[PDB]
Design a protein around this ligand. Structure first.
Ligand SMILES: NC(=O)c1ccc[n+]([C@@H]2O[C@H](COP(=O)([O-])OP(=O)(O)OC[C@H]3O[C@@H](n4cnc5c(N)ncnc54)[C@H](O)[C@@H]3O)[C@@H](O)[C@H]2O)c1
Ligand SMILES: [K+]
Ligand SMILES: [K+]
Ligand SMILES: [Mg+2]
Ligand SMILES: [Mg+2]
Ligand SMILES: [Mg+2]
Lengths: 56, 56, 48, 20, 309, 105, 52, 255, 123, 33
RNA sequence: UGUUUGCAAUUUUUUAUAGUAUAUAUCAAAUCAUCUUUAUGCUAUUCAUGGGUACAGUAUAAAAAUUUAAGAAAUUAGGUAAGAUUUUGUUUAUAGAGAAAUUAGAUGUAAAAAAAAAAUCUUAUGAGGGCGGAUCCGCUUCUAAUAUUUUUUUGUAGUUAUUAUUAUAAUAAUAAUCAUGUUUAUUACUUAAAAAGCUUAAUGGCUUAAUCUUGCCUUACUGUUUGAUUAACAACAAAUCUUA
């Protein structure tokens, strides 16, 4: 989130509009998933899905 | 960093309060007097002793 | 007229400066800023 | 400071002994 | 027994009471004098921090109970006669006076939701905001029955003094601050005006009074001085109005300036305050009661006469 | 335990409460002031009458805990000292009343 | 028998010209009370007792 | 008056004062407060004998008698057994010497009392920081679905204690670390130590893989043992080393 | 003005800089205070548990009598539980004259008065 | 103050030793600067 | 000799010793300005300005102090850390006090403790599962975790007291039960909407912080640079956000 509340992607991926009742009961969030078939919000107990993002 | 305020209390004494009936009890007060002889009190007021005829 | 633009001159005598605004009915400005000539944080003081 | 008063007070006592 | 074996065998609480001979040779005043030296200091030199940065800061503050702590207040010094009197005798009566017998197998009452929701067949009712409090804008607290587990008691007392004229004569606030100092035994906190009125010359956000709050035994002792030494001496006093009460178990009333000097703490030094600078105070007695009638009943149990307002 | 505890806490109050200003209760050079000063000298400067002899300040302030059997912490000793103070020791002229001509309370 | 509880502000009990056939009266503590009254009569009225 | 007696204040105060136990100091309030706790510990020990003999009666009782069978008999002895443990801790939690012995490190950790205070010390600060390191560094849910630590673990490299979550040098972390573990539970159990590196970069599949840098098992540990050196896991102490200590390393460029 | 200065001198003493500092106890003194603290809190428990035990017993006695009273009948041609329903009424309990001022006003005192009790009181 | 003097001497020596070391190293820093 | 005078009590570090990496002591720093004359004076008494005497735990003559409220005022707005979380209005009551002045209030619940059976999905960097083409992709069984069921149940004690039976104890029922803790308890969840506050109108947002309070600060930094504003304003330029 920027200064004026503008939301930007931090990673390459696909935009996903969802609601996280575990995080906040009455908020709606925007995310970015590395796999288009994934669904948010990710279960709090699942391992974090992250990409290396480096070249050798 | 919330400040921890220190209590500012004045010197206190232990005073004997002798009511108009002669009964004496101990109290914690700030006055320097040792014995407070009370000539007038609830034990010598008609409003608190409506049935008493001596005060009537 | 109420606000003036002052110049905070470096005290490393490197000639770098910072310009900030402040009201006339106030005290002179004085800050610890980064001088890019010597590449170190030095004391900057108002010009006059 | 405190010990200084001790030496000065003790010194004053020696002057007083001679007076007495 | 194996359970007893797990206990600390070197128990110090089971040691014999000290003897008399050893008691005679224990003279803390002689030990220091004979040494003629300063004992080395201990390496444990932890002192309570002046500021609590947070729960994970390396240096933490101790609980207020600890004597070294900067919030420590010496414990009780005596038993207030009014706190003893109420609990020993009065308490059994209030429980007896106000009692409603519940059958043996009465089902527990389920408290109703005071913020109602919309239930019905209209598709709009699902996501409607919870309804407002029915009646008053703010929800009033529900009364608790007087049982052996809930006996109304006095908790704290707040004495508040408002001195509008102080703004112009700053010496009215200094004297006012001193009166509440000796009357209650605490350091009053100055208060500021909040409204602006040109007719009354009242200006907003300026120091125009002080207040104090005494808790625990200090509150009980304050009631003793009020009910038995101050209030009986007021001339032509009728009693506490029967309309007093905020609807939650708190009683409030006001004293006149000539009755504030009747306090035993104020009269002894009545000549130390400049003339006609003694203020009037508002005394708010906060109790554990949950209703106005339960509070008035409590005060009646402590010898407080009420008059029909 | 209650008696010992109160005495223990009363002495702790000496080390944490503000000092007593006699000027706030007695006017200088009066019967009350002079009478308070004489009795204050008998108490060795302690403005209180139920805590014995203890100085919150000084090199010997640490010794605030009485030994076993201390009559000072008893209630009979408190009432005795407090009643030995209510008697006036100075007449209205500022002269110390003789010890034999003092009226007990 | 249902026993109510009463508080006496002042005065003394007088058995003169009593309607009920009462002979003597005495004010006893909780300790002396159990010795005078019967066991069953005492076991029923001991729940009303107080600390002191 | 050597260093084996304590600090300079003790060695100094132990030669200018009298020889008398701390519990026997002739102080009014201290001896009047020790008499209240005295008859209390006697009342708690008198309760442990009444609850102990009450279990035998319930133990030697046919399950058929209980209206709930054998299930209602184990839940009644469960609450009784737990009620005894609290009485054993409440019998010495007020002792002034037990507090002194535990603070001086000379307390026996095989007794419930000392383990109760030792656990109340760990939770006060040490648990809080490690509970924070687990969340902030994303140990959970990365490694485990949910984890609430129950024992203390402090690792030191070459004597110097390293704080939790501290970037260490590749030379300092070249030898097996020493674990200063304190267990607050009763009995002796086997503890398995696994050091896993969860940030090994795999450039082929564009993701991270997990690499185990140390693995050991079958390590007997009691609440009286404090230090464990990961070097002598199979030489001095009993244990099975699945994989010896691998020097941590991190290639240039990767976080 | 001189009287006001006397007032200020009282507040100047209560200033945070003038008041005494936080206590500084050694280990032996601190441990001794810990026992005094520990015992006092336990002593309150015993007074609390004792005060709460008596309050519980009294309530049970009232409930027993009330529950029993509800089942009884009479006197004479009165329906069962009439007396129970009459006892639960709270007429004047929350009024102004509910509890007599004299009984409540009298409190416990360390020592008795000149006349501890008045037997000459007449209706 | 028979045995305490011996202990105080160990205290004074330790303080004096460090005070000498502090001055023996502060002089070194003033040479590198 | 900083740190409370009766004795290994906080964290890290320095040094030393024993020791084969641990252990104790020691040192420094952080946390905190606790006040420190061992008596030299005072007090009482006595004896000729003076000389003694006093014997101290019920401590003492032997140190109660020895050479003008900022926590009553300032509406100070940014970085960062911590703490607090309805502050507005309305309403109730409250000496002076009135339509209009201050203060105190204004939701409810929980805190001994569960175990166990199957089912419905969903997930898993779980079994490197199996089969097609360890990790990719499509199929997939098993375990695990979350969610859900009103599901299938079992247990719901112990402690204090009461009552009932039984021979102070046992059993059953009933009521209470967050409490080893300075009751001003504490901690967690909950408490419609509007309103207050956030440099200024209006709109949206924030109460889990963007508000408020406090501590230390001045990144309101220098150079270059990324991706966007469905390719800013339907061009260009001046602009806005953002990355390294
Ligand atoms: N505070 C707790 O630890 C605690 C624990 C369980 C229950 N409760 C409940 O809280 C309510 C009040 O607690 P409480 O019973 O401890 O009240 P309390 O009377 O014992 O304590 C209240 C205040 O009075 C003081 N006090 C108590 N006894 C005293 C005495 N003998 N002499 C002088 N001062 C004394 C205390 O220091 C405290 O400040 C009760 O209903 C009780 O059941 C409290
Ligand atoms: K700030
Ligand atoms: K609201
Ligand atoms: Mg802001
Ligand atoms: Mg408001
Ligand atoms: Mg365009």
């Amino acid at each position: 989130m920027g200064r004026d509340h503008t939301i930007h992607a931090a990673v390459a991926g696909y935009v996903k509009y969802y609601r996280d009742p575990q995080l906040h009961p009455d908020r709606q969030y925007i995310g970015v998933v590395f796999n288009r078939n994934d669904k948010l919000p990710y279960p709090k107990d699942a391992p974090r899905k992250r990409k290396l993002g480096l070249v050798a | 960093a919330t400040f921890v305020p220190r209590h500012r209390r004045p010197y206190q004494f232990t005073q004997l309060v002798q009511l108009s009936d002669g009964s004496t009890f101990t109290v914690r007060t700030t006055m320097p007097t040792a014995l407070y002889k009370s000539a007038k009190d609830s034990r010598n007021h008609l409003l608190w002793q409506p049935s008493d005829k001596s005060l009537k | 007229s109420r606000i003036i633009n002052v110049r905070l001159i470096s005290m490393a005598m490197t000639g770098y400066f910072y310009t900030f605004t402040r009201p006339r009915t106030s005290l002179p400005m004085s800050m610890l800023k980064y001088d890019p000539i010597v590449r170190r944080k030095v004391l900057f003081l108002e010009q006059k | 400071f405190l010990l200084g008063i001790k030496e000065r007070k003790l010194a004053k006592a020696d002057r007083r002994e001679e007076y007495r | 027994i194996p359970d007893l074996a797990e206990l600390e065998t070197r128990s110090a609480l089971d040691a014999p009471i000290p003897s008399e001979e050893d008691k005679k040779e224990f003279r803390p005043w002689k030990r220091a004098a004979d040494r003629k030296a300063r004992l080395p200091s201990s390496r444990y030199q932890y002192h309570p921090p002046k500021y609590n940065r947070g729960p994970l800061h390396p240096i933490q503050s101790p609980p207020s109970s600890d004597p070294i702590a900067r919030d420590f207040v010496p414990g009780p010094f005596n038993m207030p006669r009014l706190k003893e009197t109420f609990r020993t005798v009065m308490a059994s009566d209030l429980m007896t006076l106000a009692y409603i017998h519940t059958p043996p197998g009465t089902p527990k009452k389920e408290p109703t939701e005071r913020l109602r929701a919309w239930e019905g067949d209209s598709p709009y009712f699902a996501n409607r905001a919870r309804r407002a409090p029915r009646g008053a804008p703010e929800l009033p607290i529900r009364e608790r029955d007087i049982s052996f587990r809930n006996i109304p008691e006095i908790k704290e007392i707040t004495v508040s003094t408002f001195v509008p004229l102080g703004l112009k004569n700053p010496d009215l606030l200094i004297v006012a601050r001193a009166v509440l100092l000796a009357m209650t035994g605490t350091m009053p906190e100055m208060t500021r005006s909040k409204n602006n009125v040109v007719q009354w010359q009242l200006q907003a956000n300026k120091p125009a009074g002080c207040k104090t709050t005494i808790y625990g035994n200090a509150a009980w002792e304050f009631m003793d001085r009020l009910i038995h030494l101050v209030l009986p001496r007021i001339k032509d006093w009728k009693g506490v109005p029967a309309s007093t009460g905020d609807g939650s178990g708190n009683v409030q009333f006001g004293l006149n300036p000539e009755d504030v000097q009747l306090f035993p703490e104020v009269e002894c030094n009545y000549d130390m305050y400049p003339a006609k600078m003694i203020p009037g105070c508002h005394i708010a007695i906060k109790t554990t009661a949950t209703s106005d009638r339960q509070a008035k009943l409590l005060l009646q149990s402590l010898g407080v006469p009420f008059y029909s307002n | 335990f209650e008696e010992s505890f109160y005495f223990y806490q009363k002495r702790l109050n000496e080390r944490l409460t503000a000092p007593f200003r006699k000027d706030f209760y007695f006017k200088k050079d009066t019967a009350a002031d002079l009478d308070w000063r004489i009795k204050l000298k008998e108490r060795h400067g302690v403005p209180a009458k139920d805590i014995g002899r203890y100085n919150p300040r000084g090199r010997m302030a640490w010794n605030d805990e009485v030994l076993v059997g201390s009559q000072t912490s008893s209630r009979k000793h408190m009432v005795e000292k407090l009643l030995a103070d209510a008697e006036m020791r100075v007449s209205e002229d500022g002269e110390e009343i003789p010890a034999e001509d003092r009226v007990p309370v | 028998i249902f026993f109510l509880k009463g508080r006496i502000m002042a005065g003394q009990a007088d058995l003169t010209d009593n309607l009920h056939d009462l002979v003597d009266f005495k004010w006893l503590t909780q300790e002396e009370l159990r010795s005078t009254l019967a066991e069953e009569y005492f076991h029923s009225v001991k729940g009303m007792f107080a600390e002191r | 008056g050597g260093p084996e007696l304590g600090s300079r204040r003790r060695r100094a105060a132990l030669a200018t004062t009298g020889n008398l136990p701390f519990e026997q100091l002739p102080y009014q309030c201290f001896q009047d407060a020790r008499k209240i706790l005295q008859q209390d510990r006697a009342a708690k020990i008198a309760q442990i004998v009444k609850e102990t003999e009450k279990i035998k009666l319930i133990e030697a009782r046919d399950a058929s008698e209980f209206e709930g069978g054998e299930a209602a008999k184990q839940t009644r002895i469960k609450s009784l057994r737990k009620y005894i443990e609290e009485l054993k801790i409440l019998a010495d939690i007020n002792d002034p010497e037990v507090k002194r012995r535990f603070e001086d490190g000379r307390g026996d950790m095989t007794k419930p009392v000392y383990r109760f205070m030792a656990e109340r010390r760990w939770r006060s600060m040490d648990y809080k920081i490690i509970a924070q390191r687990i969340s902030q560094f994303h140990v959970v849910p990365d490694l485990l679905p949910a984890f609430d630590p129950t024992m203390d673990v402090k690792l030191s490299f070459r004597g110097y204690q390293v704080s939790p979550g501290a970037i260490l040098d590749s030379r300092v972390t070249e030898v097996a670390p020493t674990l200063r573990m304190q267990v607050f539970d009763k009995g002796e159990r086997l503890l398995t130590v696994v050091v896993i590196d969860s940030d090994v970069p795999d450039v082929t599949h564009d993701n991270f893989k997990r690499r185990c840098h140390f693995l050991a098992a079958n390590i007997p540990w009691d609440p009286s043992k404090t230090v464990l050196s990961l070097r002598s896991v199979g030489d001095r102490v009993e244990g099975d080393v699945g994989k010896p200590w691998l020097p941590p390393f991190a290639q240039k460029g990767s976080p | 003005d001189p009287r006001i200065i006397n007032i200020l001198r009282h507040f100047a003493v209560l200033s945070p800089k003038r008041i005494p500092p936080p206590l500084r106890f050694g280990r032996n003194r601190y441990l001794r205070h810990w026992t005094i603290h520990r015992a006092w809190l336990l002593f309150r428990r015993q007074q609390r548990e004792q005060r709460e035990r008596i309050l519980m017993q009294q309530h049970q006695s009232m409930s027993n009598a009330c529950e029993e009273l509800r089942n009884t009948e009479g006197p004479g041609t009165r329906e069962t539980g009439y007396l129970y329903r009459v006892a639960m009424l709270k007429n004047g309990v929350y009024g102004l004259k509910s509890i007599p001022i004299e009984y409540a006003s009298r409190a416990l005192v360390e020592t008795p008065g000149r006349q501890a009790w008045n037997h000459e009181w007449k209706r | 103050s028979s045995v305490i003097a011996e202990l105080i001497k160990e205290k004074l020596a330790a303080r004096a030793e460090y005070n000498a070391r502090q001055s023996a190293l502060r002089k070194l820093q003033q040479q590198k600067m």
